[PDB]
Every structure is written in C-alpha cells, then in structure tokens.
C-alpha cells in the first residue's frame, strides 16, 4: 500500500496552516482575516463573485481542499485580486488596503519560495495529477 501520498498531503497541510497563521497574525493583513462584511460594504457582492479571506483558507485546509501549493496560492491570489478589483484608488485608505493586498500576495509567495522544497511541491502537484487520471 502507498499511504505515502497521504503523508505528502499531511505535511503539505501542516505547512499551509503554518504559513496561513503567519499571514493572519501579521498586523498588515488583519483586513484579510475575515470575510468582507456586506453590512459595512453593501456593494462588495456586486463586484466580487468569489470572496476569499484567510479564515476561509484555514477552513479549506481543514477540509482537504488544497492538494498543492498552486491550489493554495490560487486562493491567496484571489484575496489579492478581489481587493484590487473591488477597491478604487480615491483616498489614502483605498491605497493602504490595495498595498496590503499586494503585500499579502508577495509575502505568501516569498515564504513558500524560501521554505518549500521544490521536489516536495512537484510531488504534491503530480499526485494530484495521478488522482485526476
């Protein structure tokens, strides 16, 4: 039996949860730690069809929705792109949130590039591919 594939996914999830935790406790990214509240931003749902935030990323780790770093960074990229699509550039608060969105993306990418073994990631990607096939 090849339970080694599951060992890969277990180690991936532990790594993803640790990365997400480090993003979620960074004061810069507090705005991305909870879903956008339509009571405070009533037009958000009219711009953004696929909302995403760091607490939802945690839930998706728990539910085994990330088999690859690519799948995970897709959701980090979604947090960023939603913020850049939704938020205008009209006052200093707008500029601040947009900068934090890019810094979230860049921080997640930099951590993964520094800390993630390339062969481990490729193995995860290719198990996902074998399971698709």
């Amino acid at each position: 039996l090849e339970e080694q594939e599951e060992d890969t996914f277990r180690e991936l999830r532990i790594f993803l949860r640790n990365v997400t935790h480090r993003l979620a406790i960074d004061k810069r990214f507090r705005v991305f730690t909870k879903p956008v509240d339509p009571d405070e931003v009533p037009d958000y749902v009219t711009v953004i069809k696929q909302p995403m935030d760091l607490s939802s990323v945690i839930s998706k780790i728990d539910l085994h929705k990330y088999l690859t770093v690519k799948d995970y960074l897709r959701d980090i990229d979604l947090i960023c792109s939603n913020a850049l699509e939704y938020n205008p550039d009209r006052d200093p608060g707008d500029r601040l949130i947009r900068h934090r969105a890019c810094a979230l993306r860049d921080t997640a990418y930099a951590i993964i590039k520094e800390e993630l073994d390339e062969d481990f990631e490729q193995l995860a990607e290719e198990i996902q591919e074998s399971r698709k096939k």
């Binding site: 931003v41 037009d43 938020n87 205008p88 006052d91 608060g93 707008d94």
Partner: peptide
C-alpha cells in the same frame, strides 16, 4: 471597482 470601504 466599487465605492471603497472608507464608509
């Protein structure tokens, strides 16, 4: 883009 979150 939308209204923004400044209120």
């Amino acid at each position: 883009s939308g209204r923004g979150k400044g209120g």
